[PDB]
Design a protein around this nucleic acid. Structure first.
Lengths: 247, 186, 99, 278
DNA sequence: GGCTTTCGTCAACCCTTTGCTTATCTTCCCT
DNA sequence: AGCAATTTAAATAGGGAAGATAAGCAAAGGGTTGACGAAAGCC
RNA sequence: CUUAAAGAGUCAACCCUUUGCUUAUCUUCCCUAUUUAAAUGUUAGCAGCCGCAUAGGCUG
């Protein structure tokens, strides 16, 4: 027995489009799983999965180059060079209207759940982008599978993410089978021995290289199983769909 | 089909003694068919009550005297003692046929309101009907899924007062037979 | 000529008044060709001796169409007076004679 | 067939179908006026009665004739009909078993080769390839067949009886009709209380099982009423094809039940086939 | 003893110019 | 002061012409977006 | 606590000029719109004269 809260038409601008070194565009499912665990921390409603779809999404720039951001002189000790233009590190920006659907388990009324999600989203930040606007979130429940599809079709219109898996690698199949690659998680390289320059000193830290899976965009109504669009934190330091690989 | 299912249901009801049952059937014409079977085999209108609550204008032509068919709505019957506690001595013709029927061959929607209603006192008459009478639901597979859910709710409510549920469906799915048994068991 | 008109036969109605086409008249001017092969009746002066009604062209496939006599005259082949008059009649009829 | 405009499409194709066979076409759906509908019922019950040879006098059996009845699921519920053969548009497996029960219902002679020809697809495949069996079937948005081909989801040659419905299979419900049926039946009529379920406890106190679980949940359904030959709303009587109609009963009183979706346009009531989209 | 400023150090390309998908709809039935 | 009738049929066919061309110029810019290493005053 | 955290792309403008799409066309034959019938619904609410009446009565 499943419960969901849907925030439709989440207009967000200033999204850090740099998903990884080789992916620029839509934020991956690690971003929205991070947003889900962020509310698990601030609001206390513990979130299993998030199904996110893109209503609108434009990467700022041309069709072959992204619009770089005019950097500001914010480091310490480079005064005197501040009159000249700051050097640009690559961070593409994008705008996106999203539709989010969080699997939550809740025991109180739907009004306080909607208010808690609204108070989170008013202080949230989708992929480094300020949430410009969002409709009032609404609670829908998936008692059975037809009710699961009711929740699924309540995200209309949006293009959700379905996992199609890695056959050999990322570049090969992106040309061959023409699917989109995105960060489904990370791979740990080395333990980090210096916790002085970090957010926490006690949380263990690892250098990571983003693993990618290959995904497709399908409209949420054309997705047969809603579990193939709900991304959640898998126990391989990755994220994964509940329904597995989309067929 | 064709083996006399409703006659076998009446036989099973009469094996335990005298009959008090509500034959709830889908369609008006299937209730008419079961009423005609009940009339021509052995049951008069002092025990049977065919209830179709729409007053359809489908009349039999050709010969009124040479018909020997077209089971009608009279119910000479016997008024039960429960009519004195209903509003304004139950009602006129229809609710007297509902409550006081020993055998109530009816369309099913006069029985599924026993489980409860939105607005008004329309629950009480099928509730008090199904309290003291058995329930016989024939070909429950032709109903909808929510219709079968509220029919098994009616089965649970009928079993709540010790009455006997006869389900008569050849193409039963284990799921259906199981959930109807679990409703009867609760 | 009509197609989708919900009316079987129209008539040329110049401002309502019944009239006949100028091409009908001009075809009847040039119905002077009595100089083809099976010359029994005058036919309309055409580059092929063609009539829509009879479904045949009286000067096709037998080297007396206007184009072969025009090529011939141009080159030097002396055109017989009747052939010459036919070529001149097609010239005053008009038409594209190139290809 | 499945729905009403499907029935009039099959009828209008068969009426315009040039063949040496003497096809005599009836329409047997539910959208009909009080008089007309009742007349169809009594006639059909007295011509398809095959326990005796009394029907030889209700039809012209002298001349070799194909008496064809194009019907919606109103024939597979509560009808004591006996056809020589049936052609079924697939919507659900219990429809297959019930329309098998309308063939050789009264006789005991076994068929030799084949007495039922199941269509390859429902007609909603050409209108909605995503979902086609939801009309008069247990396919839905939560329970979608992976393939809609009935070679994939049904046996090519099969003895149709109640056995496939009696057995009960939950596995492989996305590529077989019977397991799709059983799946839905255990996933809606489950041993839980939910809110629209069957063990309902705690909610009987509330109005929830009577609002979200509505008995005879249908569409809006307004009723266009024929009063003495004159229709009420946007009806516009029309003329049928008069090619192969065997029996056509006329109607003057009564009412037709039109969904509010089809109220927008004219239902175009006709004496032969009741409601359609034209 | 770092520490913060400014000047000197070290380089060198082969590019290509839209789809990705493509929207949440009625049979029974009786009141 | 509303009443305005019903069915029946709406044409078969033959044609939709090819031959010519479809300019040549000249433009289409760069201006900022550099981090380590190394002298070298300076707390 | 989401490759989290952060960032002003600004500016500027002369698309010019030129032009022959002409040429000739048979739409055409054919033919039954036929037959009915109450306009009823009181179908009119008037003309003088008795009077202060545009109150009320009388006359045919």
């Amino acid at each position: 027995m499943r419960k969901f809260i849907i925030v439709k038409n989440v207009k967000v601008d200033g999204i850090n489009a740099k998903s990884s070194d080789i992916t620029v565009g839509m934020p991956p499912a690690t971003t929205f799983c991070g947003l889900g665990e962020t509310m698990s921390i601030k609001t206390g409603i513990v979130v299993k999965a998030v199904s996110y779809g893109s209503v609108k999404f434009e990467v700022r720039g041309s069709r072959f180059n992204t619009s770089v951001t005019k950097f500001a002189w914010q480091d310490r000790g480079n005064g005197g060079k501040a009159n000249n233009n700051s050097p640009i590190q690559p961070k593409p920006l994008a705008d996106g209207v999203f539709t989010l659907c969080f699997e939550v388990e809740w025991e109180d009324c739907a009004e306080v759940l909607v208010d808690k999600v609204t108070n989170f989203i008013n202080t949230a930040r989708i992929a480094g982008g300020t949430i410009a606007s969002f409709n009032k979130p609404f609670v829908k429940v998936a008692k059975d599978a037809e009710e699961l599809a009711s929740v699924k079709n309540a995200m209309m219109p949006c293009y959700v993410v379905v996992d199609c898996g890695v056959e050999v690698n990322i570049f090969e199949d992106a040309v061959n089978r023409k699917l989109q690659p995105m960060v489904n998680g990370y791979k740990k390289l080395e333990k980090i021995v210096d916790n002085k320059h970090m957010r926490d000193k006690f949380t263990p830290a690892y250098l990571a290289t983003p693993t990618y899976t290959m995904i497709g965009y399908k409209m949420v109504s054309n997705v047969d199983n809603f579990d193939q669009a709900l991304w959640q934190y898998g126990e391989n330091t990755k994220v994964k769909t509940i329904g597995g690989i989309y067929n | 089909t064709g083996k006399g299912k409703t006659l076998a249901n009446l036989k099973l009801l009469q094996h335990f003694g005298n009959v008090r049952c509500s034959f709830g059937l889908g369609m008006v014409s299937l209730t008419k068919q079961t009423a005609k079977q009940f009339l021509d085999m052995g049951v008069d209108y002092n025990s049977a009550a065919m209830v179709t609550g729409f007053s359809k204008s489908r009349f039999n032509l050709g010969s009124e005297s040479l018909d020997q068919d077209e089971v009608s709505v009279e119910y000479w019957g016997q008024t039960s003692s429960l009519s004195k506690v209903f509003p304004n001595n139950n009602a006129g013709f229809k609710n007297k046929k509902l409550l006081s029927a020993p055998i109530l061959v009816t369309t099913t929607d006069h029985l599924v309101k026993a489980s409860g209603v939105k607005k008004g006192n329309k629950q009480m008459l099928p509730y008090v009907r199904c309290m003291h009478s058995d329930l016989v639901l024939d070909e429950i597979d032709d109903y909808g899924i929510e219709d079968m859910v509220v029919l098994a709710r009616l089965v649970y409510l009928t079993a709540c007062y010790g009455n006997k549920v006869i389900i008569s469906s050849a193409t039963i799915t284990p799921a259906i037979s199981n959930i109807f048994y679990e409703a009867y068991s609760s | 000529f009509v197609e989708n008109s919900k009316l079987s036969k129209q008539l040329f109605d110049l401002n309502g008044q019944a009239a006949m086409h100028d091409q009908k008249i001009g075809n009847a001017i040039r119905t002077i060709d009595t100089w083809y092969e099976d010359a029994t009746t005058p036919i309309a002066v055409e580059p092929y001796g063609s009539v829509v009604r009879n479904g045949v062209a009286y000067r096709a496939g037998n080297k007396t169409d206007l184009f072969t006599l025009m090529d011939g005259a141009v080159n030097g082949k002396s055109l017989t007076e009747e052939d010459q008059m036919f070529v001149t009649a097609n010239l005053i009829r008009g038409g594209v004679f190139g290809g | 067939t499945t729905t009403i405009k499907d029935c009039v499409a099959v009828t209008q194709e068969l009426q315009n179908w040039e063949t040496d066979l003497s096809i005599k076409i009836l329409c047997y759906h539910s959208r009909f006026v009080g008089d007309t509908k009742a007349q169809m019922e009594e006639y059909l019950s007295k011509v398809l009665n095959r326990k005796g040879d009394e029907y030889k006098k209700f039809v012209d059996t002298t001349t070799p004739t194909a008496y064809i009845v194009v019907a919606t699921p109103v024939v597979e519920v509560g009808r004591d009909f006996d056809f020589d053969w049936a052609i079924i548009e697939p919507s659900s497996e219990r429809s297959i078993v019930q329309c098998a029960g309308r063939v050789l219902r009264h006789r005991s002679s076994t068929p030799t080769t084949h007495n039922i020809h199941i269509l390859k697809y429902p007609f909603k495949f050409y209108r909605n390839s995503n979902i086609c069996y939801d009309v008069a079937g247990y396919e839905s948005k939560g329970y979608k067949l992976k393939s809609k081909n009935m070679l994939d989801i049904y046996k090519k040659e099969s003895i149709v009886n109640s056995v496939n419905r009696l057995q009960g299979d939950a596995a492989f419900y996305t590529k077989s009709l019977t397991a799709l049926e059983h799946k839905v039946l255990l996933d809606k009529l489950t041993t839980d209380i939910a809110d629209t379920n069957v063990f309902v406890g705690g909610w009987q106190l509330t109005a929830n099982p009577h609002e979200y679980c509505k008995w005879r949940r249908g569409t809006k359904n307004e009723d266009l009423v024929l009063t003495d030959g004159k229709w009420s709303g946007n009806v516009t009587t029309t003329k049928p094809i008069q090619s192969k109609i065997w029996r056509k009963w006329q109607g003057e009183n009564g009412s037709i039940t039109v969904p509010e979706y089809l109220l927008d346009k004219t239902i175009c009531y006709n004496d032969f086939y009741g409601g359609y989209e034209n």
